[PDB]
Design a binder for this molecule. Structure first.
Ligand SMILES: [Mg+2]
Lengths: 452, 414
RNA sequence: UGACGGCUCUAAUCUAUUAGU
DNA sequence: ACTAATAGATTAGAGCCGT
């Protein structure tokens, strides 16, 4: 008989330091941790796209009721949740003609096609960014379906990458999402039906817009102080690999500071997805210096986690550049071995937060499960748990589980209950997808506002 | 004294608005009694307050809250109470329904000016908060303590996790028994053409130049010419109990490599016996499924849970892929699959078509549906009552529990 | 690319071992 | 040293549907 220890759900801080377990409830009830004065929109689309965007903004002004209000919380309205104003009439609209898109699409070179499609939008924003006095906080790109389907060296990745040197928060919204009712797959019904999940769509879009405009919808507090939770992701370039780092740590006031710590890092090694000693030393020195400048003193622990296992050489380099009094914990999080738990009698999956301890150096954690708070399980099918292995260093296998579960609750790109994989890894993955989309960038923007 | 703000509404529909507003007002230091917030004769308790406890009577007005006679009763008493209080600024309507024309209300309220919530709730709450200070309604400090209690009693006490014990059926099938000892035979020279072990009927792997196998040196004689004449007393034999304990560490072979060879032998034996068993196989990208076919299953079903099926034009077949993992405890990790066949006789040769079906078919099946199918499909493998054996040698073999490992958890949900 | 999740198909590396160059 | 084979492992990706 195998015993499953249980890890409870951590609490995330909201306005006035009040705690809750669901962003979709904590925000609607309490309000964001930091409030902004308002959001100046910026739209780069057609007249059709501008009309759609204004319609959607005014629609989310009013409360949004989704079909199953009980399982997924309703949307009070943008100003009702966040406390700032987001009007559809303050749009600094920059028109894009379908004809110039058409002449771009007719070019033989696909790489030049996607480069020119990116260049159109970015140069119009670049131009507006420097030639418009009206300040714009977030630029919302209402792209048509032709861009999405004809152009497939990715539109989104390069577009986010080529704006990094100018530091312009952007939000791509395909017109299929905003006008889903009038986008039908010739059957007479929408291509993807948002009807029962309209409120959750409003939640996600509004949260993304609020975050990119300088607001912090919620922050984390159920993590150990003095520890720099650091995540690495390796991305393929074809025979090079690129490593990206995202770090989250409590400050002097115990407030989470989540920032990327990524410079271009390329390793040529026979072993896949590893790092030469120089790159590893540079990465750890950057992270430690960032913690030092944010808090003064050095961390009491460097909780390095990744989807891969570290070899000896890079760990020795890590230790060599590490000062004294600081411990290093290298944790590998893998999601490949199928351990599907079926409940004996019933029809709803295992509760999220259950944890199976293999031994002192490994565990299974169900970061995806059935959450009673929303009554809606995060997985349609049986949820595969994440295998958390303490690869190197000394740690408490339950403390690592609770730390990972806490790190699974800071996804600002979506206002879901919690993320299946820890957020630092997923955001480092997004950075790697973007930082590698364009050529190596000097001092790349270190804030997720410019990536997600 | 009367320091409570009564909130009246439709019971099954206006809950969302009133819950937000009541919690919003409570968070600001007010004392708000709402039936959704504090209901537990019902007319008598609310009347007491309306005539004694209520200081304001906020009407969540909508196209249904004005057709709810129960609600109209609550206004009828409010109005009177208003006359007892001479408080003309008592009933303060709250119109959230943009569908409501604002000018289709009962005479009692049609003469009173609403607070507009039709266009956005935030300005309406700003309007309400504006009115409440204007009418000097007293309010306590917005302490998030007693207010926190109401918040949890409403939503954060619901977060509660049933602390009863549940039983979870996984997909790990432990290996009941491993052979007494591991044997390293030497057929390097006896090998007629150093051929692979496809001819061998017993799982064998040539570690270095020694064909190690759980089959005895004499077992290979039919498919192995020259090897037929092999002398004994020249076979490296390692205790499998020592290997699994990770105790055998010799320069000839390490524990890691020996366990690797054990895993490989188990995988081969499963593939072998699979052929012994009546079931068609499927070539997946990186595994071998077993697409059950018509004839091998009565009514395309077994152990009371189908393992086969038929789609709109194709046929779904519940298949499984086995990979034995000694870590943590020797188990035969089994994975569920669905193979769609053109007519239950031949699998579609299009991976994209097969995948798109697996997906659509996956919507129908549930937790219990997958568990029953997996357990029934495994129970077909059973040779004896409570297990099934996978030969690892003519004399030695590996037995695997036909029931998966049970996992028991501390907590459950509703 | 509002999102999340499951799955499917490729691909390489690592390690061991033998063969050959 | 360097290629080929058989694995098992460990990681990438590309993809395609569901909600
Ligand atoms: Mg985003």
């Amino acid at each position: 008989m195998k015993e499953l220890i249980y890890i409870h759900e951590p609490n995330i801080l909201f306005a006035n330091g009040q705690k809750c377990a669901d962003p979709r409830d904590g925000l609607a009830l309490f309000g964001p941790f930091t409030k902004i004065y308002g959001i100046k929109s910026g739209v780069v689309g057609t007249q059709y796209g501008l009309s759609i965007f204004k319609n959607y903004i005014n629609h989310i002004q009013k409360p949004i009721y989704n079909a199953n209000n009980i399982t997924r919380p309703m949307f009070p309205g943008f100003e009702a949740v966040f406390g700032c104003k987001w009007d559809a009439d303050n749009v600094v609209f920059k028109e894009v003609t379908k004809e110039e898109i058409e002449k771009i699409l007719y070019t033989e070179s696909n790489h030049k096609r996607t480069y020119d499609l990116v260049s159109l939008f970015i140069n119009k924003i670049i131009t507006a960014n420097k030639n418009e006095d009206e300040k714009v906080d977030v630029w919302f790109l209402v792209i048509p379906d032709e861009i999405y389907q004809y152009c497939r060296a990715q539109f989104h990745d390069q577009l986010k990458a080529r704006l990094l040197e100018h530091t312009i928060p952007t939000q791509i919204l395909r017109e299929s999402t905003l006008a889903w009712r009038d986008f039908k797959n010739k059957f007479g019904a929408p291509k993807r039906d948002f009807s029962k999940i309209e409120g959750h769509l409003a939640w996600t879009i509004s949260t993304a817009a609020f975050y990119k405009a300088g607001g912090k919808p919620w922050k984390l507090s159920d993590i150990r102080s003095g520890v720099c939770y650091l995540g690495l992701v390796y991305k393929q370039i074809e025979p090079k690999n690129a490593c990206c780092a995202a770090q989250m740590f409590l400050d002097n006031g115990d407030g989470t500071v989540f920032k990327g710590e990524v410079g271009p890092w390329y390793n040529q090694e026979k072993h896949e997805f590893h790092l030469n000693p120089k790159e590893a030393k540079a990465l750890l020195t950057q992270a430690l210096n960032s913690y030092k400048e944010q808090n003064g003193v050095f961390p009491k622990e460097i909780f390095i986690h990744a989807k891969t296992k570290f070899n000896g050489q890079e760990w020795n380099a890590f230790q060599e550049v590490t000062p004294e009094g600081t411990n290093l914990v290298g944790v590998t999080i893998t999601k490949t071995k199928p351990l599907k738990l079926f409940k004996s009698e019933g029809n709803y999956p295992i509760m999220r937060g259950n944890a199976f301890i293999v031994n002192e150096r490994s565990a299974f954690l169900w970061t995806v499960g059935y959450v009673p708070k929303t009554e809606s399980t995060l997985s349609m099918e049986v949820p595969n748990p994440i295998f958390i292995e303490i690869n190197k260093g000394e740690a408490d296998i339950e403390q690592v589980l609770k730390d990972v579960l806490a790190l699974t609750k800071l996804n600002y790109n979506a206002c879901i209950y919690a993320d299946g994989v820890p957020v630092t890894l997923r955001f480092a993955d997004k950075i790697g997808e973007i930082l590698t989309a364009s050529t190596e960038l000097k001092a790349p923007p270190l804030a997720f506002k410019y990536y997600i | 004294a009367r320091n409570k703000i009564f909130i009246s509404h439709a019971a099954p529909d206006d809950n969302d608005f009133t819950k937000w507003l009541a919690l919003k007002l409570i968070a600001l230091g007010y004392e708000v009694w709402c039936d959704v917030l504090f209901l537990d004769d019902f007319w008598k308790v609310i009347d007491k307050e309306i005539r004694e406890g209520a200081i304001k009577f906020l009407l969540a007005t909508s196209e249904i809250a004005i057709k709810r006679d129960g609600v109209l009763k609550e206004i009828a008493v409010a109005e009177k109470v208003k006359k007892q209080l001479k408080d003309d600024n008592f009933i303060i309507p709250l119109i959230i329904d943009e569908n409501l024309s604002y000018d289709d209300l009962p005479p009692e309220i049609i003469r009173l000016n609403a607070v507009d919530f039709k266009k956005s709730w935030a300005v309406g709450l700003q309007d309400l908060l504006k009115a409440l200070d204007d009418q000097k309604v007293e309010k306590n400090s917005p302490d998030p303590d007693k207010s926190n209690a109401l918040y949890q009693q409403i939503f954060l006490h619901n977060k509660g996790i049933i602390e009863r014990e549940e039983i979870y059926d996984s997909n790990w099938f432990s290996i009941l028994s491993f052979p007494k000892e591991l044997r390293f035979h030497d057929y390097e020279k006896l090998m007629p053409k150093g051929f692979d072990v496809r001819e061998l009927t017993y799982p064998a792997v040539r570690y270095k130049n020694y064909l190690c196998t759980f089959a005895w040196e004499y077992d290979f004689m039919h498919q192995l010419p020259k090897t037929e004449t092999y002398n004994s007393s020249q076979t490296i034999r390692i205790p499998t109990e020592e290997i699994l304990s990770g105790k055998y560490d010799s320069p000839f072979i390490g524990n890691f490599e020996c366990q690797r060879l054990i895993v490989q032998l188990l995988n081969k034996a499963f593939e072998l016996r699979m052929k012994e068993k009546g079931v068609r196989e499927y070539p997946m990208s990186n595994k071998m499924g077993y697409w059950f076919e018509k004839g091998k299953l009565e009514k395309d079903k077994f152990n009371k849970v189908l393992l086969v099926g038929k789609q709109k034009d194709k046929h779904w077949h519940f298949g499984i892929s086995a990979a034995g993992k000694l870590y943590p405890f020797p188990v035969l990790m089994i994975s569920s699959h669905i193979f769609f066949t053109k007519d239950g006789k031949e699998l579609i040769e299009s991976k994209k078509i097969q995948h798109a079906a697996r997906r659509r078919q996956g919507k129908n099946w549930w937790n219990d549906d997958w568990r029953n199918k997996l357990l029934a499909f495994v129970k077909y493998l059973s040779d004896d009552e409570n297990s099934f054996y996978l030969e690892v040698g003519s004399e030695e073999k590996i037995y695997i529990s036909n029931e998966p490992v049970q996992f028991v958890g501390k907590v459950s949900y509703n």
